[PDB]
Design a protein around this nucleic acid. Structure first.
Ligand SMILES: [Mg+2]
Ligand SMILES: [Mg+2]
Ligand SMILES: [Mg+2]
Ligand SMILES: [Mg+2]
Ligand SMILES: [Mg+2]
Ligand SMILES: [Mg+2]
Ligand SMILES: [Mg+2]
Ligand SMILES: [Mg+2]
Ligand SMILES: [Mg+2]
Lengths: 141, 185, 75, 62, 142, 66, 100, 144
RNA sequence: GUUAAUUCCGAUAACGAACGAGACUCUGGCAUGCUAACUAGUUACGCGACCCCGGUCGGCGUAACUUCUUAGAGGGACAAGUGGCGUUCAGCCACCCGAGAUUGAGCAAUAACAGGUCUGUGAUGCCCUUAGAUGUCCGGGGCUGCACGCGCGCUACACUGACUGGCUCAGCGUGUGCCUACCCUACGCCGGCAGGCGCGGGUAACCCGUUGAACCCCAUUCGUGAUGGGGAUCGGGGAUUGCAAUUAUUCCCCAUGAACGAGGAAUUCCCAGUAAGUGCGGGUCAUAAGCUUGCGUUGAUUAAGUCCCUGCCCUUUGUACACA
């Protein structure tokens, strides 16, 4: 009886995103390659298939803590913005990426717009992430 | 539990300090055998508590130098770990014996001071301090603007100094200091 | 005051070279490999990876800042 | 010309133009009869061993 | 049978770790995660020092669940290590005889005192005229 | 620098003869003596007075104090 | 019957005295209450430069103004509680009654 | 694989500019003026060039495919906000200027401002700072 | 003789005193002992979701309880125990037990400066001007101007690194206004970003907020090339604030890609959760931090000394000095 908590989280996201690629039911956006992930960043993501990871990462985050809205997702993925000859600061992520990712994980039944705002993990979507932890846990062993 | 071994890989036993002059100022043995080169602290509170700090810890603390990496213990700990790995597979025995031998051969035994300068000998504690200082600064300068990583620069500096080959930076400073001191005698 | 001219891809004079004595080094690392063969750092990483698969060098440690290789045990 | 090593018997005081060198008297373990006074640079306890490159010159008292 | 519970806390700079030790079959888990999967992984033997220095047979029969809040990455590491050691001592004190706490407490201290006694060091305030507690701005005589 | 100021020394030198029969040998018992037998504005000053009185008694045993 | 009273005052010595009295002032009339609960102390800080002129060493003032907050609650109708809080109020302490 | 190809070209000539073949393709084509560290990356993704390949490794059809994309950005789903000459004054056309075109275009804008004797034109003529920053103690070594 | 101390012991033509120091206030540490907690929580219970009896659940509700959170009262540490040094006094060193055997600030004497402030004041003497005003208001410009010299800082010169992903940790503290316009923000849609549009909470341990902060950590690409280091300068475009932004307020996008390869003589700050790295709040704020003032995080090398340099305190001594 394994669970997302009990398995290594670093390669858990790698396996969960590859499952989404095999499904082919995510409805990726059309500017996936010409967009920059956040203003504090400097280049486009090196891997072309980042959208499968970004969807996977948010789906993992919604498991640990529910009720995370779009304004939460931009704060979770923010980082240090180097401002030239200015001291660096903290800059939030992009809203559009979070919105389309959350709308992506809702198109197929993985999340739902629960009350009080934000999104939570649906009971059937919870099964999917628990199935992945099964194969990741045994693969290391 | 017995046989506390560094990193869970290197055994602290079978390490022998040949020079009795610095025996009590190098902490390798059973009372100071720890799984990690990381420790809480409280070693600078009094004058001689420094000698009860494990020697591998004292080397890690001598690697957070030159501004860019003050107070970065995690990066320094992993540097020593990788350096100890490649000292073993390049020399063939426990790196603790390599590090200890370098300390013995690198700490200068005589210096000069303003009292024209007079030649005075060095106390055992400062001999340890100078050794760790010299061994680390050699690795730092050998890795700056160079392709090879900081880990192997630290590895060969310990290896070269242990054999006393004179091609290491630490030894080139020791004989310099002892040759100047002799001329000031 | 000195300039390094490191190639990016093996010549046929060079690929056959590191299949002879590189699997015989005690210490194998992209940094040390680069300076003996005068090749780019990335080139050594890609080459040392292929030799790893063939089983002629065994991996002892792997970190984002350094990967370390040894040679196969004698006999 | 061999090299001798000796142990300090007590700490006499702090000397030097800037208080950076200590006078202590050393006692050879090779010979338990001969003791001399020497300057030493660095923090020194009582009973530790000093490596004497040459052990023929005596340090004047302060 | 009766519930065998004791809840002890651990301290560091600001991080605190309260551990609920009950009677079980040898379970250890932090925030719902095991000890080995605790970031950063480079500081892993710091968590494993009390268990390795005592063995699993002493941790058999109990379950530990440590929850943490505050401090930093390294500060927490020294808080979980603080609570698990203190929890085992406070268990053998109340539900096991005194002869079992003593040799446990001897072993823990002689490895390091700070494994059962908190560290009083705390950050100190910043004074005006300097970037920190004791540093001062550059003098500009001319 | 643990040097007793005249305020701590004077109170101890006055308390001690008025209550030599009550004041004893240990610090904790005569800490309780001073709290009620004389008004002390603060704890930290009471401890210093009581501590010096304890030190004074041991001197009295060997020989008279001037 | 659920009524809650708030006690906010700068002085911490006096605020407890009124707090202590009303717990006694309620328990005497055998009506159950929930104990004195204390909100975290609020510190107000105004850091300013000492000198009105320009020169001098750069010196600053550390002003503070603490606010201590207390809550007590009663299960009683309005007619009893009006006269409870109308007697023996320290001038520093202020009392405000609310109905849940 | 890791052996030098027989067709490897150490210097490529695109848009009257030398390109270092020993460099990665994404960063090598940055050599021509008008393309940066990001516009180069999207161009090589609007088309299908293996980013891992170095500049001197890809075929001549592949490079001539790349050149056409750059000079006609709007024809291949390049967003309009990703250009450096959006909504110009001459033809109102959102275009991408490259190599000598960027140098020629800049010099015309500088003489355009001086044509009407605007303030920024005069500052450029006098060789001073134009964006309102202080010139009391900065930018000294250039001005003798 | 002693102390951090004109702090004490003690000598004594002095006796008894006064301020300052110390005492004192706040703050840090630690108390499973006390008082409490639906604006703080824990444990058990009963559900429910998921994995295969157990496990996870900041998903829900409830019976005790106060360890974690909060805030009050008391406690606790005193050179008190022990061993040496000492006129055997004042006291000092070390060790045992201990949370702790020097936490950090605040306040702070007599005398003086011709130190700064008349641009803080309806604090003010005297002098000047007062209707073509040195009063007050309105429009525009300047206080930013650039052959140069100086000071406080920020960003850098790279691999102990940069970039792209993933992973995981805080603490102080603010928030809708007397005039007075001007608050903090959750959620959902629109956009690539800056942002815009509907909707709710909060006068606050109630909501933003479990403040998902950086550094750090793991995995990629780069490979010693002024290069994917560095981001100055300059062109084009889009928003927000404001009655008005041009001499670009600020923000965002593309492109442009300078010096800089560790810094001469010289000089500053610092010794323990300290230096340094790192980010986050208040102040200034219509628009708003390279500054200051606070907070946490990661966390050292060296040293327990001296009067050599710069100065300070007491005694003796010389003086042709006394705005010294
Ligand atoms: Mg983040
Ligand atoms: Mg290097
Ligand atoms: Mg004056
Ligand atoms: Mg004047
Ligand atoms: Mg006149
Ligand atoms: Mg000005
Ligand atoms: Mg460059
Ligand atoms: Mg860059
Ligand atoms: Mg004379």
């Amino acid at each position: 009886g394994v669970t997302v908590k009990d398995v290594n989280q670093q390669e858990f996201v790698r396996a969960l995103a590859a499952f989404l690629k095999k499904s082919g039911k995510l409805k990726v956006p059309e500017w996936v390659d010409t967009v920059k992930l956040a203003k504090h960043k400097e280049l486009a993501p090196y891997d072309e298939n980042w959208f499968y990871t970004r969807a996977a990462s948010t789906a993992r985050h919604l498991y640990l803590r529910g009720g995370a809205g779009v304004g939460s997702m931009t704060k979770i993925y923010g980082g240090r913005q180097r401002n030239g000859v200015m001291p660096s600061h903290f800059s939030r992520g992009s809203k559009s990426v979070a919105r389309r990712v959350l709308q992506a994980l809702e198109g197929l039944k993985m999340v739902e717009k629960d009350q009080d705002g934000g999104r939570k993990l649906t009971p059937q979507g919870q099964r999917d992430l628990d199935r992945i932890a099964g194969q990741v846990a045994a693969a290391k062993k | 539990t017995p046989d506390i071994k560094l990193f869970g890989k290197w055994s602290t036993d079978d390490v022998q300090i040949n020079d009795i002059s610095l025996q009590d100022y190098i902490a390798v043995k059973e009372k100071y055998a720890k799984y990690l080169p990381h420790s809480a602290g409280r070693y600078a509170a009094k004058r001689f508590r420094k000698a009860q700090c494990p020697i591998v810890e004292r080397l890690t603390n001598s690697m957070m130098m030159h501004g860019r990496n003050n107070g970065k213990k995690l990066m320094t700990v992993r540097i020593v770990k990788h350096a100890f790995e490649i000292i073993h597979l390049l020399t063939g025995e426990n790196p603790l014996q390599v590090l200890v031998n370098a300390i013995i051969n690198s700490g200068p035994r005589e210096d000069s001071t303003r009292i024209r300068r007079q030649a005075v000998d060095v106390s055992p504690l400062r001999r340890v301090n100078q050794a760790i200082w010299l061994l680390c600064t050699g690795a730092r300068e050998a890795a700056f603007r160079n392709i090879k990583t900081i880990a192997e620069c630290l590895a060969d500096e310990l290896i070269n100094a242990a054999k006393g080959s004179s091609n290491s930076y630490a030894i080139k400073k020791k004989d310099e200091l002892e040759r100047v001191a002799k001329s000031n005698r | 005051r000195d300039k390094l001219n490191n190639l990016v891809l093996f010549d046929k004079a060079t690929y056959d070279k590191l299949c002879k004595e590189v699997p015989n080094y005690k210490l194998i690392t992209p940094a040390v490999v680069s300076e003996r063969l005068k090749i780019r750092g990335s080139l050594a990483r890609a080459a040392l990876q292929e030799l790893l698969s063939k089983g002629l060098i065994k991996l002892v440690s792997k970190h984002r800042a350094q990967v370390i290789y040894t040679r196969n045990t004698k006999g | 010309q061999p090299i001798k090593l000796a142990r300090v018997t007590k700490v006499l005081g702090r000397t030097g133009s800037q208080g950076q060198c200590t006078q202590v008297r050393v006692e050879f373990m090779d010979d338990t009869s001969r003791s001399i006074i020497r300057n030493v640079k660095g923090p020194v306890r009582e009973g530790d061993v000093l490596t004497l490159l040459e052990s023929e010159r005596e340090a004047r008292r302060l | 049978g009766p519930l065998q519970s004791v809840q002890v806390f651990g301290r560091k700079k600001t991080a605190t770790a309260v551990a609920h030790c009950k009677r079980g079959n040898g379970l250890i888990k932090v925030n719902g995660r095991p000890l080995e999967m605790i970031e950063p992984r480079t500081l892993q033997y710091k968590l494993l020092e009390p268990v390795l220095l005592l063995g699993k047979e002493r941790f058999a029969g109990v379950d530990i669940r440590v929850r943490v809040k505050g401090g930093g990455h390294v500060a927490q590491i020294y808080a979980i290590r603080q609570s698990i050691s203190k929890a085992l001592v406070a268990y053998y004190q109340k539900y096991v005889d005194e002869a079992s706490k003593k040799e446990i407490k001897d072993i823990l201290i002689q490895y390091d005192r700070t494994l059962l006694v908190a560290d009083p060091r705390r950050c100190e305030s910043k004074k005006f005229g300097g970037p920190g507690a004791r540093a001062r701005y550059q003098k500009s005589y001319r | 620098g643990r040097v007793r100021t005249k305020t701590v020394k004077k109170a101890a030198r006055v308390i001690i003869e008025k209550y030599y029969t009550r004041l004893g040998n240990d610090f904790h018992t005569n800490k309780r003596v001073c709290e009620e037998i004389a008004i002390i504005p603060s704890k930290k000053l009471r401890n210093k007075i009581a501590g010096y009185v304890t030190h004074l008694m041991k001197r009295i045993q060997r020989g008279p104090v001037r | 019957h659920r009524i809650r009273i708030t006690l906010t005052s700068r002085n911490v010595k006096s605020l407890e005295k009124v707090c202590a009295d009303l717990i006694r002032g309620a328990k005497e009339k055998n009506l159950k209450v929930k104990g004195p609960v204390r909100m975290p102390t609020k510190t107000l800080r105004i850091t300013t430069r000492k000198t009105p002129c320009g020169e001098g060493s750069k010196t600053w003032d550390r002003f503070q103004m603490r606010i201590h907050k207390r809550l007590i609650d009663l299960h009683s109708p309005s007619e009893i509680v009006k006269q409870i809080t109308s007697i023996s109020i320290e001038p520093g302490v202020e009392v405000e009654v609310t109905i849940a | 694989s890791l052996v030098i190809p027989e067709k490897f070209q150490h210097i490529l000539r695109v848009l009257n500019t030398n390109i270092d073949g020993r460099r990665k393709i994404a960063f090598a084509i940055t050599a021509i003026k008008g393309v940066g560290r990001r516009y180069a990356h999207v161009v090589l993704r609007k088309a299908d060039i293996d980013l891992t390949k170095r500049a001197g490794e890809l075929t001549e059809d592949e490079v001539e495919r790349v050149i056409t994309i750059m000079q006609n950005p709007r024809q291949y789903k390049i967003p309009d906000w990703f250009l450096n000459r959006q909504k110009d004054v001459k033809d109102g056309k959102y275009s991408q200027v490259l190599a000598n075109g960027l140098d020629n275009k800049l010099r015309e804008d500088l003489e355009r401002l001086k044509k009407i004797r605007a303030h920024r034109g005069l500052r450029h003529f006098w060789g001073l700072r134009v964006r309102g920053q202080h010139t009391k103690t900065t930018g000294r070594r250039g001005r003798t």
